[PDB]
Design a protein around this nucleic acid. Sequence first.
RNA 1: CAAAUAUUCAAAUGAGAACUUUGAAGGCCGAAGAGGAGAAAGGUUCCAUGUGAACGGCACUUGCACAUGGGUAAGCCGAUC
RNA 2: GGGAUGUGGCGGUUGACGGCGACGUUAGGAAGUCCGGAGACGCCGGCGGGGGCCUCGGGAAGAGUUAUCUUUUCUGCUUAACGGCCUGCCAACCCUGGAAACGGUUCAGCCGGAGGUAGGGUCCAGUGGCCGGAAGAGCACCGGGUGUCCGGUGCGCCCCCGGCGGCCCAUGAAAAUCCGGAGGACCGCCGUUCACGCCCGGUCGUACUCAUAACCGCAUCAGGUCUCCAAGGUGAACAGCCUCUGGCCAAUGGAACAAUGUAGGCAAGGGAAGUCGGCAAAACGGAUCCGUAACUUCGGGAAAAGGAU
Lengths: 68, 50, 101, 89, 106
Amino acid sequence: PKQIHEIKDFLLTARRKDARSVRIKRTKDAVKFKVRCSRYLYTLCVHDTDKANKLKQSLPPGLNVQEV
Amino acid sequence: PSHKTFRIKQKLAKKQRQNRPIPYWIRMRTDNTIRYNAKRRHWRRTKLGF
Amino acid sequence: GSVSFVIDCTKPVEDKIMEIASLEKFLQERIKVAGGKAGNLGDSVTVTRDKSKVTVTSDGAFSKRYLKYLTKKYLKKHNVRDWLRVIAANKERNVYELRYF
Amino acid sequence: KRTKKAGIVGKYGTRYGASLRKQIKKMEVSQHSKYFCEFCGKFAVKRKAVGIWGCKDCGKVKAGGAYTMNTASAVTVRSTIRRLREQTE
Amino acid sequence: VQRLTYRKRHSYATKSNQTRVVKTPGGKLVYQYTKKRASGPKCPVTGKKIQGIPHLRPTEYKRSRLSRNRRTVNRPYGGVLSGPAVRERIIRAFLVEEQKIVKKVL
RNA sequence: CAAAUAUUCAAAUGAGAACUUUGAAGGCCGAAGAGGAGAAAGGUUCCAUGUGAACGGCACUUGCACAUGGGUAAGCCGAUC
RNA sequence: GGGAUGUGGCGGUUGACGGCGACGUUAGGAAGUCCGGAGACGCCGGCGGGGGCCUCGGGAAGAGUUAUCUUUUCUGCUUAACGGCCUGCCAACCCUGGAAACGGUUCAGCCGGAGGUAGGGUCCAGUGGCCGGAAGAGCACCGGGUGUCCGGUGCGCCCCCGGCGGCCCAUGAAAAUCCGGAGGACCGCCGUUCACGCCCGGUCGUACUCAUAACCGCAUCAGGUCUCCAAGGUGAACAGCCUCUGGCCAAUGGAACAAUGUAGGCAAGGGAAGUCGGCAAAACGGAUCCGUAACUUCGGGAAAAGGAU
Ligand SMILES: [K+]
Ligand SMILES: [K+]
Ligand SMILES: [K+]
Ligand SMILES: [K+]
Ligand SMILES: [K+]
Ligand SMILES: [K+]
Ligand SMILES: [K+]
Ligand SMILES: [K+]
Ligand SMILES: [Mg+2]
Ligand SMILES: [Mg+2]
Ligand SMILES: [Mg+2]
Ligand SMILES: [Mg+2]
Ligand SMILES: [Mg+2]
Ligand SMILES: [Mg+2]
Ligand SMILES: [Mg+2]
Ligand SMILES: [Mg+2]
Ligand SMILES: [Mg+2]
Ligand SMILES: [Mg+2]
Ligand SMILES: [Mg+2]
Ligand SMILES: [Mg+2]
Ligand SMILES: [Mg+2]
Ligand SMILES: [Mg+2]
Ligand SMILES: [Mg+2]
Ligand SMILES: [Mg+2]
Ligand SMILES: [Mg+2]
Ligand SMILES: [Mg+2]
Ligand SMILES: [Mg+2]
Ligand SMILES: [Mg+2]
Ligand SMILES: [Mg+2]
Ligand SMILES: [Mg+2]
Ligand SMILES: [Mg+2]
Ligand SMILES: [Mg+2]
Ligand SMILES: [Mg+2]
Ligand SMILES: [Mg+2]
Ligand SMILES: [Mg+2]
Ligand SMILES: [Mg+2]
Ligand SMILES: [Mg+2]
């Protein structure tokens, strides 16, 4: 497993062809976005409520999205 | 042991099949003299030296 | 700050098993504060009453597990420990309550 | 102090005889001594094995005596070899 | 106190069977098998450690398993000779070569 | 039929209980153990269900016995090099 | 690990940059030939570090005791490989500088004009920290919900590591495998040990016992048979004795206490008179203080002996 820091790098990874699904995990602190790729699971931590929503709406329409 | 050669396991399988009672219908045959297996082995007695 | 722990005895009195006045009185006589003598009733710890719940409050540090120890002792002293148990309230973590088995 | 005559040989206790302990004393002392390194100029040469003498700091290793760095005949042999080499010329 | 067992069929405390105790998220203790301590690269002329390279088992240095910066040092005789050894060889190579010319002239 | 401290009570099951099962109590091993796992060696003794006799040097409803079935999954543990 | 294949990146001063330097950065030519390292190694003794365990306290959850006392006793309160960043022990190395009125320094050592102390750095390893994995799991409670937290200590125990010292007429494997290097023949739209991406991974073993009943001793035989883990108290202590986890009451049962046995004790007064013979038993015993002869190979004798607590 690997962590992603900036939002844009998560955007390109979720747009990868080998990306299969995105899991959204809600914690009491932040919101974790996990995209399952071929070799690694990439996790990005969003500490902002609206940035989580903007990320949710701006995801690629072709990728599956799951709520955890 | 747990660590077995294949050739030892194959022989152990045959010896497992061979120690069964004789079928009951064998005793009903026309000229039958067989009573029991005469070759049953129990593991605690009569070890097979492999 | 002002630490407050409250024992909720709502059910036991609606079924007339014990009396919260005896519970409150048991608490004022058997509380040691700041490592002093038992039931000294200093200026810090105070015990107040309601119709159903007894409230303990102090300006120093008070351990909630001490209140549970004193409540269970009171239940044995008045022969209700078999029928009642002290349970932390799901809603609030500064609150106990008495529940039937 | 701790002993009037035994010294290093007191590790052997009362065993093996007084004459044998006195015999082994000189070689026990000499084989555990620190010798001068001609290459670097320090008293850092220690016996690594019988005949092998290594300096701690400069790292030179030298073939020498069994229990002393230079045997007496080694000096005599070197002088004979040196005189033969010069007189050869 | 949660005594432990070996997890494979090696029953003897050999150097290749060394274990460590770890706590799992299951709240228990299990054995994990470790790797034997290995020397790193060594210098043949000084005997000292070669700086800049980790101390691993030989097959953990494999190219597919280790990055190139970790494997090498950027200097002639990089992972083979230390800096002091390389300085001495350069100076010896040049100074003896000058002596060869002086021998030729004289 | 006497080494290795030791059993007791109530209930259940069963033709039959000092010896099976459950609960309670009293004790022992005392962690270089009478605990938990392996290498040799064994080879089905492992698990379930059932029980004529024999066997378990007293007994048994019970089993390391007997009968009928079931059970051992690897690119990473090993062999293999 | 192997095999195919792109997309992106990287280099062409043909074969990259940075750093005084130690060295750093995910990439960043190359054939025959040659060179080095790792693998790769004994025993003993201190010291230091990390992990686990034990142990003291606080908080919260549940349970035990409760005539009296007990802010109490008990249980649990967890975090894997793998990846990134940080840290950077003890050694080792680098740069500046130039030391006697010598200094630095260990439990011990030992170190310094062949460059110390000092100042500033590089690397090394970790079973170290944080994040991802990962709370969604596991556990404990309450009826879906709550919580999964904060400290302290050490000649403690087990494992591993580090770094010193000692010892030898004893110096304590090899090979497969992997990495690095020297050289530079040869070569330009061709090179690429980089990232991401695609496919594949054979055969045989695997149950169970490992022993006062699964092995050998003709047996379900008080014998014999190689290992790992290992808690609390007392105590110097893996001694003995008691306890927790876990495991067991399987060793035919009942009645009664004759002789003689077997195993274990005591016995007034005497104290080896017993017997081939003090055989057997009894006496002594830990720790602290005092004190300790002849003889001696000068090392011992010695815990001599003898007293006190
Ligand atoms: K390097
Ligand atoms: K295999
Ligand atoms: K070896
Ligand atoms: K691993
Ligand atoms: K298995
Ligand atoms: K046995
Ligand atoms: K008798
Ligand atoms: K006598
Ligand atoms: Mg047998
Ligand atoms: Mg035969
Ligand atoms: Mg007898
Ligand atoms: Mg019995
Ligand atoms: Mg005992
Ligand atoms: Mg006991
Ligand atoms: Mg078992
Ligand atoms: Mg069975
Ligand atoms: Mg019988
Ligand atoms: Mg059978
Ligand atoms: Mg393997
Ligand atoms: Mg010694
Ligand atoms: Mg300094
Ligand atoms: Mg995490
Ligand atoms: Mg949970
Ligand atoms: Mg041990
Ligand atoms: Mg080259
Ligand atoms: Mg042990
Ligand atoms: Mg003690
Ligand atoms: Mg003990
Ligand atoms: Mg018997
Ligand atoms: Mg009897
Ligand atoms: Mg007498
Ligand atoms: Mg007398
Ligand atoms: Mg006499
Ligand atoms: Mg006589
Ligand atoms: Mg006589
Ligand atoms: Mg005697
Ligand atoms: Mg004497």
